[PDB]
């Protein structure tokens, strides 16, 4: 009380400016007293944030600080008897209302719960005050600050500054766990390094349960056993073992019995049972059209660009919905394309027939719109129906085009000219052909693929490619896009959707299809010979899956060919296997599934349990997988009559084991080009919460919702405990129980206190010790929106707009500013579209859900005969707005087709308008939107417009002054959630949460737990603690280079040697072990740090994962409305709704083990008891083992003595390592002939290449943001890929496949583009920058006007190197630009200006010249910036290729343009220039129009010069020389042979080299590097210093002798 009087003072400073600081302010003048002091006298600061995020938003300021049902009772309003909560401020007008909340955290580790749970607590309103008649918006403004208005941030952090004395002066002078939470909450902005230090300073008290605990977990673990006393037991053991189970046979190994696989695997894959065909084509349904393609053709136009242009024009008009509904804006420009039909009908004699049916339509068709097939006689009816309502309809309609309008109209008069309709039935009856079928859901004479000839198999890919480029753009097709006919097997095809491909000059082909969007649709191709129709087939399939044979007839044949050309040693071996290859990749792209994948996945396990010795008994049961459909049966087929063609012969078909090895591993791999993307989430989330939960419901541990701040019930207790003692029972001598998941105590004790001493291979020593915003909500990972952020923006775009329309009373809204504010929090009509169309489907319907309920809550913000009896009101309508209690999510499968028309198509009444109204009066839009689906053809929106239309949504106060737990939420700063005093069992603050979500893993789906980001905090200090355990630990291997290279080279030394060498693996790694194992691990650790010598205290490791052992894992919600429809998890939530009726949305239990969550401690455990089972076999079994580890794979390298009749020692590790939940899965396979560790197959004297998961990560994960960056990753991926040696002929066909690519989104050609074909030594010796200068001066053929330029940038280079220094100050001169550059540093070395004249004509057309290709700094300071400061492929593809047709490249002034209209800028310059290269190179003249992207090609080769001078060199300035027979299948190993004469580690030589380069760029956000660091900063195709810094990431090439030895030579 020595400041009190000093507080009077200090809040003097401010003007009573509302009614809450005076009367607040009375109050305190009028007693001296510290008890009111820290609370009325505290609380000030909490109202005056409440007020002041209360003047943030519209609100009205509770003073009050009342219930909701008492807020909603002001005026006439019945309670809707409303669950009892307290907001932060209302705003309630019309028939809405705003619940504002006002939290700040200054920490981001507290500032999620309580936002989750004030979400969550106005999530659990909106249920029982929805069905009252108003919805609300609940808005947060969750803070990390104190940001207010009436003070300015000079008093309020001497709130809790100058008053630190005043409660330390009540603790004296007059709350126990309270008190350390306000001083945590009262923190600064903190830079708060919470280590496991933090821990020692929280209370740790007990709850007597965590007794009971260590009596359940830690009373058979004593750390204190002899050296002698395990031997003793182990001898023992091992003399139980070998004559008790391993010689009645219940071992787990056996000795593969060579002839017996092969028979297995005929009974295996090849269904015999099944009455499948065996010809492919006749059982999948897409192999027999591909087939009908092309064998349609083998055996055999000024219009037309007319035709295109104004079919891109109309492209170009419909995306501005300039016609005020989404019906007439279709059939408008259906009859602007009609009429141009009719007109190019009248042009010429012959031009319907010769140059349309041969080209864009055909029979009873015309070609149109968004890729519509329209089957043109429905129009004839439409438009005659437009004039049945309209009668003068081109009056107006026409003028809209022309003003309030883009007003050029580059049609000839189609918009005023009325339709001759004689004519267009005359047309229409000319063309007699068959209407399209769609078939849904024999005979066989496919002529037998073994036997056809090799030119055309090709044919079946390339028309594969151009079928699957056609599946591909049906995502181009708008994703909204209502057609105009609604609407059962087999369809005559009234109009459709249709993409085209191309076969020869005669035909084309189609694509029909009905529905919009990316999911599977039921496809259906047709040819068109020269105008005929001709049915060829329908199939039902994804077409997102189809990515990888896009373009790569030519990749998929190589690779093929390249394959098969590894089995050159017997000749009709080699003749056999190509066409069955062959088909079994045509079989594997044209049926991509999940189980043919995963028996793909299965057949690498095959392949090395029958390449090696021994292998396990439990895999055939595992190997196979139920053939869904027939489709999967040809594969299945496939794949196994190929292994026991070249695996079971009758000679002895072993010979050359390592190229069939190869070969099948690569048949195996094979799988990889089959897309990960798991065709539906939700039958992913089932099967990843059903392998979450098998194994935790089968031992007997998956509880149902714990209380999530701490305690647990008594019957959890007991559960919790006795799966407890049931996990770590597990006696040392019985035999079954072998697969239970839990570990032997006894056998740990002995590991654990065996590892104390010195005596394993590894030891705890522990040098340097290891003691130093939109975040998701848990219910729902994998998606795209949580529920949280699907109501945050739709809260942010209301909250924006109740302000903005009430500036005058102007009480309207928008309707396409309320299409934009969403569309810009989430990512005027060209502004729209512009970002409209980056979009995936499922943001498409993510925006529609968001657009429906912000237009809801918007229409009952202003607002202040359902007896249509044909159907009943209460037993239809009523009822199914009260079963759902939702409009919105009212079913399409309760229902009819028609009701949904019939009850739209009531007469018109009050609930209608017509005359549309775009003005669109706010409250009016009752009448508004619901009309804009009474003019439009979708009936069922209109539907549930109507279902919401008609009301069918229905002294004691001075000791309990201090804040105590009765008076915990009066603040708003106060943070009751914080980690105050932890139980054993949580943290006082949360129970450790985790999600559920899928990695999308090739074969079978790695679950993946997202955390909770306290929990993220609190696993990070457990992994980090681990980390540098294993740092210490000398035979792991999940971080190092080194451990793992090591573990490399000792595995290829080993299979050299002969030594037989395993590769376990695990089964379940996560779902069977727990953290209550790592609790009994870490109790007897020592970890006896060289600093003291002295066991460390592990409490603070054992106290959090003891958190660990208590997780309360989330479900998806998506997986309980999945199994809240009507299978053993399945059965496990329909056994509990007979418990306690709550849903069962948590689980804790004792077997957790998240993945990727408790890794390396788990890695801990697995090179502790490794190396434990290391030292068994050492003594046991008289062998040297030496055993790495990855934490779920593994490598124990076995040396032997003086042939597998060491099966005891395998069977016997095994049993040991079951008894320590190490279940060696049946995957693991054991011998002296393949040896596997993190997918890397070694064998004798060789390395597997292993083909084709690199050649599929090539053609697959092709990101997309510009071209620049698209042939940026894939030459990364090209370089990692030839890094194996695969060839040059797949790689040069990669780079085809990626430039065709490029080319098909409309870019057009560049000189950089992707990397060059016939690429044959720049890998080795070459980063991009080498290759691009390649590919520049492989354009110049003659190297004649590129030896000047050499040798201009060799009198550059002579005089910027070291010795001397001539102007290294050319800081300014190149940043000026490319062409001044280049004629200064050409003058500069020394010649005449008419080498500048003949040189800078040659110049090729930018696009990225201004900025990048805007499809919504230089690279230099975007890599610099990654440096320093440390969602399928082919939807991404489309969402490029249609931003990047749109107005993407820009020009000097403010504005964008198209590409096109760009290359339209262009002239013809025939001499010598540019038809040196066509489209590639130019004149100065040729490009007059458009000359400001014209840049040089020279100075981008001389940059490339002096680039490949800086990274490497003295060589790159030679002529290209004249090279000048081995095997073909004889590979080695090069160095990559660099002289980079700069000195190395440039992570800082460059940072403080950007003073003298650019000082603003650094401030507002050596002797060599600086000549060629502003070569950089003004491109974008250089990238100078991304491989000077960084390293080249493989250093390891192995290249063939062919393309090696024919390679190029450029010399010095």
């Known amino acids: 009380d020595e400041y009190v009087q000093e507080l ?47 003047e943030a938003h519209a609100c009205q300021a509770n003073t009050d600080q009342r219930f909701v049902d008492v807020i909603l009772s002001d005026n006439g309003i019945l309670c809707p008897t409303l669950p009892k909560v307290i907001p932060d401020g209302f705003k309630l007008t019309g028939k809405t209302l705003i619940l504002l909340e006002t939290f700040v955290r200054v920490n981001p580790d507290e500032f999620e719960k309580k936002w989750k749970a004030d979400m969550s607590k106005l999530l659990n309103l909106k249920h029982d005050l929805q069905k009252s008649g108003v919805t609300l918006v609940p808005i947060v403004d969750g803070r990390s600050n104190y940001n207010n208005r009436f003070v300015a941030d000079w008093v309020i952090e001497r709130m809790r500054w100058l008053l630190i004395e005043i409660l330390k002066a009540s603790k004296s002078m007059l709350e126990d766990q309270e008190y350390q939470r306000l001083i945590h909450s009262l923190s600064n902005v903190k830079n708060q390094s919470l280590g496991l230090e933090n821990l020692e300073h929280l209370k740790r008290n007990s709850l007597d349960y965590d007794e009971r605990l260590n009596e359940s977990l830690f009373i058979g673990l004593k750390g204190d056993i002899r050296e002698s006393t395990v031997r003793e037991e182990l001898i023992k053991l091992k003399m139980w073992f070998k004559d008790e189970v391993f010689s009645k046979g219940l071992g787990k190994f056996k000795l593969t019995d060579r002839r017996e696989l092969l028979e297995s695997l005929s009974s295996l894959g090849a269904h015999l049972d099944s009455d499948v065909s065996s010809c492919p084509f006749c059982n999948n349904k897409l192999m027999e059209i591909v087939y009908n393609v092309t064998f349609s053709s083998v055996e055999r136009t000024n219009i037309e660009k007319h035709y295109l242009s104004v079919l891109s024009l109309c492209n170009k008009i419909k995306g501005l919905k300039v016609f005020n509904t989404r019906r007439n804006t279709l059939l408008f420009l259906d009859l602007i394309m009609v009429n141009l039909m009719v007109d190019i009908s009248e042009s010429c004699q012959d031009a319907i027939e010769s140059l349309r049916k041969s080209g864009l339509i055909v029979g009873q068709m015309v070609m149109l719109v968004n890729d519509r097939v329209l089957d043109i006689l429905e129009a004839i009816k439409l438009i005659r129906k437009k004039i049945g309502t309209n009668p003068n309809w081109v009056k107006n309609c026409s003028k809209i085009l022309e003003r309030s309008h883009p007003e050029i109209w580059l049609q000839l008069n189609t918009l005023i000219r009325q339709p001759d309709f004689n004519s267009l039935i005359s047309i229409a009856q000319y063309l007699v052909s068959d209407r399209p079928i769609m078939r849904y859901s024999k005979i066989c004479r496919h002529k037998l693929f073994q036997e056809m000839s090799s030119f055309e198999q090709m044919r079946l890919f390339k028309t594969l490619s151009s079928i699957s480029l056609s599946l591909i753009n049906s995502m181009k097709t708008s994703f909204s896009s209502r057609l105009l006919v609604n609407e059962f097997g087999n369809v005559r095809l009234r109009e459709c959707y249709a993409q085209r491909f191309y076969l020869a000059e005669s035909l ?173 989430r939700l039958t992913d989330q089932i099967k990843c919460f059903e392998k979450f939960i098998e194994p935790k419901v089968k031992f007997g541990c998956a509880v149902v919702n714990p209380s999530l701040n701490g305690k647990l019930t008594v019957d959890q207790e007991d559960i919790m405990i006795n799966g407890l003692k049931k996990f770590f029972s597990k006696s040392l001598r019985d035999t079954e129980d072998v697969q239970t998941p839990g570990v032997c105590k006894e056998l740990l004790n002995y590991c654990v206190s065996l590892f104390n001493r010195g005596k394993l291979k590894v030891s705890g020593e522990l040098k340097n010790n290891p003691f130093r915003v939109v975040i998701p909500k848990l219910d729902e990972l994998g998606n795209i929106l949580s529920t949280y952020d699907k109501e945050k923006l739709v809260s942010a775009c209301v909250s924006s707009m109740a302000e903005r329309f009430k500036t005058k009373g102007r009480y309207n809204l928008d309707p396409e500013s309320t299409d934009y504010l969403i569309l810009k929090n989430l990512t005027s009509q060209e502004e729209l579209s512009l970002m409209y169309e980056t979009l995936t489907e499922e943001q498409v319907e993510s925006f529609n859900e968001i657009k429906y309920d912000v237009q809801v809550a918007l229409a009952k913000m202003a607002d202040n005969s359902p007896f249509g009896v044909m159907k009943e009101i209460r037993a239809e309508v009523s009822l199914h707005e009260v079963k759902d209690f939702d409009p919105d999510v009212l079913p399409s499968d ?9 009850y739209k198509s009531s007469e018109k009444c009050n609930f209608f308008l017509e005359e549309v109204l775009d003005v669109c009066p706010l409250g009016l839009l009752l009448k508004n939107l619901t009309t804009s689906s009474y003019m439009e053809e979708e009936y069922f929106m209109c539907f549930k417009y109507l279902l919401i239309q008609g009301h069918f949504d229905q002294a004691d106060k001075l000791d309990k002054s201090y804040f105590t737990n009765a008076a915990l939420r ?116 020592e970890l006896r740090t060289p600093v003291d010598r002295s066991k460390i205290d592990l409490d603070s490791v054992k106290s959090i994962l003891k958190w660990h052992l208590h997780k309360v894992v989330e479900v998806p919600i998506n997986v309980a409305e999945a199994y809240c429809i009507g299978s053993l998890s399945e059965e496990f939530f329909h056994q509990t709704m007979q418990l306690s009726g709550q849903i069962p949305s948590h689980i804790m239990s004792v077997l957790d083990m998240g993945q990727g969550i408790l890794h390396n401690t788990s890695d801990l455990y697995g090179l502790i008891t490794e190396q434990f089972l290391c030292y068994a076999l050492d003594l046991l079994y008289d062998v040297i083992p030496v055993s790495y580890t990855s934490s779920d794979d593994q490598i124990t390298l076995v040396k032997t003595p003086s042939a597998a009749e060491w099966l005891e020692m395998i069977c016997f590790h095994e049993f040991l390592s079951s008894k320590l939940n190490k279940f060696v899965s049946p995957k693991s396979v054991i011998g002296t002939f393949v040896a596997e560790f993190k997918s890397r197959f070694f064998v004798m004297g060789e390395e597997t290449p292993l083909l084709t998961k690199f050649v599929s990560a090539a053609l697959h994960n092709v990101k997309c943001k510009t071209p620049t960056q698209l042939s940026e990753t894939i030459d990364t991926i090209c370089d990692q890929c030839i890094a194996n040696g695969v060839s040059t002929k797949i790689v040069a066909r990669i780079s085809k496949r990626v430039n065709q690519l490029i080319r098909y989104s409309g870019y057009g050609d560049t000189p950089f583009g992707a990397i060059e074909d016939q690429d044959v030594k720049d890998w080795v010796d070459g980063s991009r920058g080498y290759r691009l200068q390649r590919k520049i001066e492989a354009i110049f053929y003659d190297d004649k006007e590129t030896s000047f330029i050499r040798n201009c940038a060799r009198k550059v280079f002579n005089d910027i190197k070291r010795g001397r220094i001539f102007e290294e100050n050319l800081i300014n001169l190149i940043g000026r ?55 399928s492929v082919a939807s991404g593809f489309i969402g490029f290729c249609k931003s990047m047709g749109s107005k993407c490249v820009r020009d000097g002034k403010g504005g964008f343009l198209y590409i096109k209209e760009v290359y339209s800028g262009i002239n013809v310059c025939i001499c010598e220039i540019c038809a040196l290269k066509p489209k590639i190179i130019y004149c100065n003249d040729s490009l007059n129009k458009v000359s400001q992207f014209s840049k040089p090609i020279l100075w981008d080769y001389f940059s490339l010069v002096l680039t490949n001078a800086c990274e490497l060199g003295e060589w790159v300035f030679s002529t290209v020389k004249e090279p000048q027979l081995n095997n073909q299948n ?83």
Request: aromatic residues 10%; hydrophobic residues 40%.
């Open 8 to 54: 009077k003072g200090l809040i003097r400073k401010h003007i009573p400016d509302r009614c809450e600081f005076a009367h607040q302010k009375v109050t305190f003048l009028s007693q001296v007293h510290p008890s009111p002091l820290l609370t009325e006298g505290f609380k000030l600061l909490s109202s005056l944030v409440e007020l002041e995020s209360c």
């Open 1530 to 1612: 004889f590979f080695w190993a090069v160095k990559p042979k660099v002289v980079r004469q700069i000195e190395d580690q440039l992570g800082m030589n460059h940072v403080l080299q950007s003073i003298r380069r650019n000082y603003p760029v650094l401030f507002d956000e050596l002797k060599f590097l600086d000549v060629c660091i502003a070569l950089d900063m003004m491109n974008e195709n250089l990238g100078i210093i991304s491989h000077l810094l960084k390293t080249r990431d493989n250093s390891v090439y192995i290249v063939k002798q062919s393309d090696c030895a024919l390679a190029h030579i450029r010399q010095s």
């Open 970 to 1085: 009066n603040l708003c700063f106060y943070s009751e959630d914080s980690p105050t005093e932890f139980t054993s069992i949580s943290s006082n603050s949360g129970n450790l949460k985790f999600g559920l979500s899928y990695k999308e893993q090739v074969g079978s789906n790695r679950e993946l737990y997202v955390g909770d980001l306290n929990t993220k905090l609190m696993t990070r200090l457990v992994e980090d603690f681990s980390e540098a355990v294993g740092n210490s630990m000398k035979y792991t291997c999940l971080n190092s280079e080194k451990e793992f290279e090591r573990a490399i080279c000792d595995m290829k030394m080993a299979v050299n040697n002969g030594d037989l060498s395993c590769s376990y693996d695990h089964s379940k790694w996560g779902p069977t072990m727990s953290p209550a194992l790592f609790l009994a691990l870490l109790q007897m650790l």
């Open 508 to 680: 084309v082909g189609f694509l029909f299809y009905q529905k919009t969007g990316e999911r599977s649709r039921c496809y259906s191709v047709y040819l068109s010979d020269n105008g005929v129709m001709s049915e060829q087939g329908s199939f039902y399939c994804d077409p997102k899956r189809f990515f990888l044979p896009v373009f790569s007839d030519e990749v998929l044949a190589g690779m093929c060919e390249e394959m098969t050309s590894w089995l050159d040693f017997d000749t009709g071996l080699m003749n056999d296997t190509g066409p069955i290859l062959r088909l079994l990749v045509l079989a594997i792209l044209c049926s991509p599934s999940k189980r043919n994948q995963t028996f793909l996945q299965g057949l690498r396990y095959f392949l090395m349990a029958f390449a090696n010795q021994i292998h396990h008994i439990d895999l055939i049961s595992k190997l196979v997988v139920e053939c869904k459909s027939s489709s999967e049966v040809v594969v299945q087929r496939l794949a196994v009559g190929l292994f026991i063609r070249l695996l079971g012969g009758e000679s002895d078909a072993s010979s050359f084991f390592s190229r069939r090895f190869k070969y099948l591993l690569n048949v195996s791999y094979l799988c990889h080009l089959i897309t990960k993307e798991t065709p539906d």
């Open 894 to 902: 309760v229902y009819k087709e028609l009701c949904d028309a019939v």
């Open 1377 to 1431: 630009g490319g062409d001044e550059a280049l004629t200064g540093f050409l003058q500069y070395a020394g010649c005449s200006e008419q080498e500048v004249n003949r040189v800078l004509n040659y110049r090729w057309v930018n696009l990225s010249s201004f900025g990048d290709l805007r499809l919504v700094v230089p690279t230099l300071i975007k890599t610099l910036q990654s440096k320093l400061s440390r969602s």
